[PDB]
Amino acid sequence: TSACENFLLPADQDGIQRQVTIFRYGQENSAPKAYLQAGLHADEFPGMLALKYLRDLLDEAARRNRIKGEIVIIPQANPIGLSQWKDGFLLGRFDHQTGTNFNRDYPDLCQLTVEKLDGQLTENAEHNIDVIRKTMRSALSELKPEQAVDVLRHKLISESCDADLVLDLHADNQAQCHMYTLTPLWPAMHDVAAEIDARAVLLAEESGGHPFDEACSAPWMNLSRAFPDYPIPLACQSATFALGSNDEVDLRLAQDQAEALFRILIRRGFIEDVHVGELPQLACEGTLLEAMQQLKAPCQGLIVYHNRLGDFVRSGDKVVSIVDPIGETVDILAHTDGVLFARHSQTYAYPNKVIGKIAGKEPL
Amino acid sequence: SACENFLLPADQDGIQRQVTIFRYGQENSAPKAYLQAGLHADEFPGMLALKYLRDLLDEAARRNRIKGEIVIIPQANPIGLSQWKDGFLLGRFDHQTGTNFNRDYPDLCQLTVEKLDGQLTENAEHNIDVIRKTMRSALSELKPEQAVDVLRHKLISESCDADLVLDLHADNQAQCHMYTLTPLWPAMHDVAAEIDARAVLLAEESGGHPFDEACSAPWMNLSRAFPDYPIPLACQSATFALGSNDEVDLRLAQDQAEALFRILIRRGFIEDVHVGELPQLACEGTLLEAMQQLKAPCQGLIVYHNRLGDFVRSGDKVVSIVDPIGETVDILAHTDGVLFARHSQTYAYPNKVIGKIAGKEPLPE
Amino acid sequence: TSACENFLLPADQDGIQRQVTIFRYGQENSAPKAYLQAGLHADEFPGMLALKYLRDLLDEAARRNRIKGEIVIIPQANPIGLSQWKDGFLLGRFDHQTGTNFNRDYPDLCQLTVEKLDGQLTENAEHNIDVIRKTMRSALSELKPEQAVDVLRHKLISESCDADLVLDLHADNQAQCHMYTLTPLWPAMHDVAAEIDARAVLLAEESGGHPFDEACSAPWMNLSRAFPDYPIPLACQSATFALGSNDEVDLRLAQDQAEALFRILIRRGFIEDVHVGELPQLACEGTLLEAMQQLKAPCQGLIVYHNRLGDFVRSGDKVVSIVDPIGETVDILAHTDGVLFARHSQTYAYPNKVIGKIAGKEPL
Amino acid sequence: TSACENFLLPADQDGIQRQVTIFRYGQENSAPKAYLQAGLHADEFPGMLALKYLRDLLDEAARRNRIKGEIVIIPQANPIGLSQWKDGFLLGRFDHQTGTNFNRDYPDLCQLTVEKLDGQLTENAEHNIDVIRKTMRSALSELKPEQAVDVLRHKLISESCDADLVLDLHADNQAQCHMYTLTPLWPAMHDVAAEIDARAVLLAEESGGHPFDEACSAPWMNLSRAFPDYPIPLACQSATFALGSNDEVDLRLAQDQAEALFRILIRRGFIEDVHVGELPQLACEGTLLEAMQQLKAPCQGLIVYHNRLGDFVRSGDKVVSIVDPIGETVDILAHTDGVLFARHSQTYAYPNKVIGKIAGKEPLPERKGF
Ligand SMILES: N=C(N)NCCC[C@H](NC(=O)C[C@H](N)C(=O)O)C(=O)O
Ligand SMILES: N=C(N)NCCC[C@H](NC(=O)C[C@H](N)C(=O)O)C(=O)O
Ligand SMILES: N=C(N)NCCC[C@H](NC(=O)C[C@H](N)C(=O)O)C(=O)O
Ligand SMILES: N=C(N)NCCC[C@H](NC(=O)C[C@H](N)C(=O)O)C(=O)O
Numbered sequence A, C: 001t002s003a004c005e006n007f008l009l010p011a012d013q014d015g016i017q018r019q020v021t022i023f024r025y026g027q028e029n030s031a032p033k034a035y036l037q038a039g040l041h042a043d044e045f046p047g048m049l050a051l052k053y054l055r056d057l058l059d060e061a062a063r064r065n066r067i068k069g070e071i072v073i074i075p076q077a078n079p080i081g082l083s084q085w086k087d088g089f090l091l092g093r094f095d096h097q098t099g100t101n102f103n104r105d106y107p108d109l110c111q112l113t114v115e116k117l118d119g120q121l122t123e124n125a126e127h128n129i130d131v132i133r134k135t136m137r138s139a140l141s142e143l144k145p146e147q148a149v150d151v152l153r154h155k156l157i158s159e160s161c162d163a164d165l166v167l168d169l170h171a172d173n174q175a176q177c178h179m180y181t182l183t184p185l186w187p188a189m190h191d192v193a194a195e196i197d198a199r200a201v202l203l204a205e206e207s208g209g210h211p212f213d214e215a216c217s218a219p220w221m222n223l224s225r226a227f228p229d230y231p232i233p234l235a236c237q238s239a240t241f242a243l244g245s246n247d248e249v250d251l252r253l254a255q256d257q258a259e260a261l262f263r264i265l266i267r268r269g270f271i272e273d274v275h276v277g278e279l280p281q282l283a284c285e286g287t288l289l290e291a292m293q294q295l296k297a298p299c300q301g302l303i304v305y306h307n308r309l310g311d312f313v314r315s316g317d318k319v320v321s322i323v324d325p326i327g328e329t330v331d332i333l334a335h336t337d338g339v340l341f342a343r344h345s346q347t348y349a350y351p352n353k354v355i356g357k358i359a360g361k362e363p364l
Numbered sequence B: 001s002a003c004e005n006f007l008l009p010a011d012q013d014g015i016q017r018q019v020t021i022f023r024y025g026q027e028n029s030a031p032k033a034y035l036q037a038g039l040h041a042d043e044f045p046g047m048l049a050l051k052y053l054r055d056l057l058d059e060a061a062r063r064n065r066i067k068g069e070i071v072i073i074p075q076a077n078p079i080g081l082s083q084w085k086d087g088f089l090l091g092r093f094d095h096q097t098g099t100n101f102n103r104d105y106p107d108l109c110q111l112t113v114e115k116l117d118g119q120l121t122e123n124a125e126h127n128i129d130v131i132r133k134t135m136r137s138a139l140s141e142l143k144p145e146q147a148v149d150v151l152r153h154k155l156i157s158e159s160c161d162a163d164l165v166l167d168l169h170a171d172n173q174a175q176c177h178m179y180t181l182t183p184l185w186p187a188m189h190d191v192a193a194e195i196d197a198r199a200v201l202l203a204e205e206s207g208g209h210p211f212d213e214a215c216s217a218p219w220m221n222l223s224r225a226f227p228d229y230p231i232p233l234a235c236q237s238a239t240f241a242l243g244s245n246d247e248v249d250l251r252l253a254q255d256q257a258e259a260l261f262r263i264l265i266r267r268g269f270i271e272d273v274h275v276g277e278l279p280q281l282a283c284e285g286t287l288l289e290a291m292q293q294l295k296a297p298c299q300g301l302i303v304y305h306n307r308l309g310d311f312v313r314s315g316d317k318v319v320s321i322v323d324p325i326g327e328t329v330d331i332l333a334h335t336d337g338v339l340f341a342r343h344s345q346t347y348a349y350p351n352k353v354i355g356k357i358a359g360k361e362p363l364p365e
Numbered sequence D: 001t002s003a004c005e006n007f008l009l010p011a012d013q014d015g016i017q018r019q020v021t022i023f024r025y026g027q028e029n030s031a032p033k034a035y036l037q038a039g040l041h042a043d044e045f046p047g048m049l050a051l052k053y054l055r056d057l058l059d060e061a062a063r064r065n066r067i068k069g070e071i072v073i074i075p076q077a078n079p080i081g082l083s084q085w086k087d088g089f090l091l092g093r094f095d096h097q098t099g100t101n102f103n104r105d106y107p108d109l110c111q112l113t114v115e116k117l118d119g120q121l122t123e124n125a126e127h128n129i130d131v132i133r134k135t136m137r138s139a140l141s142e143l144k145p146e147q148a149v150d151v152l153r154h155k156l157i158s159e160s161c162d163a164d165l166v167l168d169l170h171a172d173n174q175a176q177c178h179m180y181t182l183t184p185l186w187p188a189m190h191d192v193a194a195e196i197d198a199r200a201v202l203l204a205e206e207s208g209g210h211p212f213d214e215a216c217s218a219p220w221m222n223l224s225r226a227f228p229d230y231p232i233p234l235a236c237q238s239a240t241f242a243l244g245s246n247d248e249v250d251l252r253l254a255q256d257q258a259e260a261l262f263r264i265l266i267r268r269g270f271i272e273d274v275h276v277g278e279l280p281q282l283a284c285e286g287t288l289l290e291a292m293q294q295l296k297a298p299c300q301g302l303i304v305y306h307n308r309l310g311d312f313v314r315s316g317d318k319v320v321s322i323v324d325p326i327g328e329t330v331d332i333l334a335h336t337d338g339v340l341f342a343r344h345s346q347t348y349a350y351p352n353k354v355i356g357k358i359a360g361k362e363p364l365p366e367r368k369g370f
């Protein structure tokens, strides 16, 4: 019913080897392929519990012989970060050994495949998809990473680059459910945004230092541009789901998110003999990431919020203040109209700390 | 208001920090109160409460209503306050020594009992002044070198001779609760009621010499060392956990500042103010040894089955540890009581304390 | 699995006979009893849409055979006000025929039952509850109202006085979600306030001219005082929910409010086999209604607000100004610290118009 | 600085005499003439506050001696409607005494002047303008209205018919800034539309029952047609500005609208020694009023919108539903491509309630005779 791989990473600075546990629910290399992972930031929990419950649903779908394609589930994509305790707190965002962000510095599969594809593309889009996916797998086989974190990033992209559907499950420090995707995959991924009840959908073609979701979807956009004489569709539809707050561990929520992910899999042809019915109403519009305001602390001090999580705020509104208990108070204003979909869990600032997010429409 | 900026020795980066101390009233006047917050630099509610208590005291000072000496330290630990790692503030342990900021305070009984051998009389007030003077002398003789030892030394040097000491703290996820010396209960019932404690935890001696016990324990221990002399519990100290570490709220901090102000009035620090009827205390004093620490026996997601503040019964499933790629382990209450604390970070390592139940029967654990 | 009653009011001044549509989802006269109504002020809409969607949820609960109690749903409790159009606007707050407020002059069930109860109470609280509820129904049966609005008020209290849970769904002209209840039912109704995300909870033992929620809950408090030798618990837990602004009709909001009401019904033992999970933390403290400041316009003119809805304001702050476009400007100040939970939808004043509300604590 | 008159209406049913306060910033019967009024519908507020701030700007222009013509400002053109409170709400759209709409049943100055002008027109357009304006004033002088609302309409047209520029400031129940003008006055009032940031410009030659803006501009079009052998230019350029939602009272917005109105006055030669500069971007095309779709509720119930104010919608899109909370749901579709520039503030319907507006380009079959 379910295959299990334990992929072993090379030893860290303490001589410790870690494993990535990967579950597969379908026929290997079959039909449509889905990839779902959680816990790439090891201190972001909601996705971990949601995929535990999605597995319970898929075990039943497997027993009933209703799995159509290949579904790949990784509830804890980052066993390195998961071990990084300091003074009794888990710091799962950055790699101790390299200092790098776990959701950065993924391979650029356009840069790795453009030369190889020069003579292989044709007028048949489906053919180009198979050629590009095969080329991507070959290009990754040629890379030889040495550090556990680079080997981990390599494995995760090697197992996801040829998928039709990729969902990277994340969380923010204090936030409402929200989604990120590639600009041209909107509104294609309207259904997934609606099912997971995103309260913000943030669009970009190219963001920061090569995150996982863009590593999966961007290559199809960049290859389409590299080879404009050939049909290259956006074959891999990836998104990042921030499912809630980092510490939001709740049975009801995880079960509801597992059921939503199951409904997404049904709608996209991974499950048969199950009815989905009407798509839920999406509570927000897609906006550009560059139109999103990061609220930053201009100084150190207590973070005092004047708005609740999810409040609509307008340009000029006082949203948060930094209070020095032995000094001055500094007021921070909204510079755009939008929804305060994120704040922060730790209510003390250092200068340039991002302490909140407003999803607006006008680029900043 | 007087302001002192006490300078700590430079750290490993050659950086010196200051402890900012505010004083209201005349030096050495009448009764003495000491209030500090942020000894654990990641525990915020007390920091904001003392900011607002200062606003109230500035007005009391303008109106010439301060009777004794009130010492306010909103951020008692500027070392911990600088300790950022991967964007998170880790303010509980000192990064040079690895020690807990609220442990390893001096034992002022051990430091004064020899000196006091020939100095005590049948006059209680005399003994209080002699013991306080001896404590100050004993501390003057100590020469700490590490910034954290210098910090602990300064904080006890400025508080040991106070009549009232309130150490303002927080827990990772908790209701307002209080700790004090067993024999100071019910003496400190009024302060517990004003701050709306939902648990009062009593001990004569706890862990490795925390600040509140460093202030009040010496009077109990000297009373026992010299049973032939009147030695009252002259320094009434308590720890207030004012809420969750990250519970920063205007309304709450203003309410806590007003409660602290009312405590100062009741205990004779503020003139020309009537307080009136004491609020109802929501809990009984219980022993710290009757408190259950809920521990994770294994790593995994922390799933709570009880809300913060629920009354739970022995045998109840209160919390589960869930391995998202493994097994689930259920954690049971071993005592009836109030779940006054849980935890903010919902993932465990083995032996992690993930919650606290205030019970009445002492536990053998 | 859902009953429908169409209760006929006597014909009005135009010879029009109107109906109150009542839906019942459970076991008649059994188990726990819940009563939910909306639209008593016929121009307050959010509750009307929320109960439409709560019915969809209860139809499914009924189909799944999960209803434990008797649940009474009245999405439009006031068909009189609902007809009162003038110049294309619906004026649903006052009765055209009598000039009276629709949420005033409800019967006092203490005054109506104290004589009857003198010899019927015992040391058994559950007995007293059944005796008092039976006595209330009898006392109301004996009343003979003639005006459609008196008949309407009579029916609504007759169907709610014996409930364990009563939620009267309202709105304000421009407001945040807020709640009113009987002072001694706080913090008993903390869970209710938390699920609906109230941003103010206003407490009173006795308010104005006998509103519906107090008509339901006050009698238990007043009978407890009338008969202090007997255990009389506050058997009917009533509250008023102002679910937002009068005109705040939104699909997402009404669905979210329907789901919150469903969660309240589950928590209070009306629905089987549903896991709810952790209670949301309440965003406000209970304050006294007597500590609330009404901001009044001292003169006619434009209402210019300086504070946004939901701002925390301090005594002395300029909150709103009245601007005469051909005359003078008058500044209106906060006289208490608290939350500006209400403003107004029509931004022009007449003298003594209430143009906003601040929920304070009445300190000294 | 400015002249101030208080024109007294005859006493109403309660024996109360109401007054219209009129401000004048220029000379008298001078140079170019501008007329700006707000609050004809007394429950439409944004224009009231905008003209308060425009007066502050004009007081300064007057102090600096920079007023070039006659500028007439009426922040509250309708003191009758302004008094009409019921159950704490202001109902300012219809006159209590007559039941008539405050922005309907204005005089037709073509019908009133065609006979008088028969022998008075010549080859000189400027002459014809002065003759027609004098004739209009005489024709109105001859009328004797009795009811307060008829006297009010009479005064407002008497003070505006001879203006070169007329801006009637209005609002809708829930709407984006939009404009109405006479079909042949477009492209010409492009500058006005651009300065106020209209999101729809709606054109008609004849709309409903004789509104104020058409009462001012239509006569020139109709007289041109009555006397085709003479040059009769569209001497009075009128427009209706719906400045926003009825209840949209905001300091920043009113100041921005006052500044835009000031820039319009500069561009059209009312303000001396001030340069405006480059014209702002026009956000929309001029479209016919008969190409505008009115969304109507076919039944009573909750108004549930599926589109935001200002969304672009396409023919076939579900825009709004009417939901009977104890009955059925009815879906309402867009039947044209365009911007949903208006919805409604009160989210409950009666049958045939207009619950929104879409500005399209293709004339719609049902939009005839308004
Ligand atoms: N493709 C993108 N544009 N974004 C990538 C997904 C966003 C994602 N964000 C977080 O993990 C939340 C984090 N606590 C925070 O502070 O934001 C990430 O950085 O991995
Ligand atoms: N034991 C005493 N007599 N004094 C009370 C000390 C308790 C106090 N606890 C805390 O700051 C909360 C901490 N997060 C925790 O997990 O306990 C402290 O360590 O200062
Ligand atoms: N006070 C109570 N006992 N509770 C009843 C809630 C009050 C309730 N208020 C409203 O519908 C809003 C109204 N615009 C206003 O200005 O209040 C009502 O009058 O029925
Ligand atoms: N076409 C013209 N000549 N004039 C158009 C003016 C329209 C203008 N309409 C309104 O105030 C808004 C109204 N709620 C509505 O539904 O339109 C008016 O009546 O004055």
Ligand SMILES: [Mn+2]
Pocket (backbone or CB within 6 Å): A304, A321, A323, A329
């Ligand atoms: Mn502040």
Ligand SMILES: [Mn+2]
Pocket (backbone or CB within 6 Å): B303, B320, B322, B328
């Ligand atoms: Mn469990």
Ligand SMILES: [Mn+2]
Pocket (backbone or CB within 6 Å): C304, C321, C323, C329
């Ligand atoms: Mn003002």
Ligand SMILES: [Mn+2]
Pocket (backbone or CB within 6 Å): C251, D304, D321, D323, D329
């Ligand atoms: Mn609908």
Ligand SMILES: [Zn+2]
Pocket (backbone or CB within 6 Å): A041, A044, A103, A170, A171
């Ligand atoms: Zn992340």
Ligand SMILES: [Zn+2]
Pocket (backbone or CB within 6 Å): B040, B043, B102, B169, B170
């Ligand atoms: Zn602490």
Ligand SMILES: [Zn+2]
Pocket (backbone or CB within 6 Å): C041, C044, C103, C170, C171
């Ligand atoms: Zn109401």
Ligand SMILES: [Zn+2]
Pocket (backbone or CB within 6 Å): D041, D044, D103, D170, D171
């Ligand atoms: Zn109008």
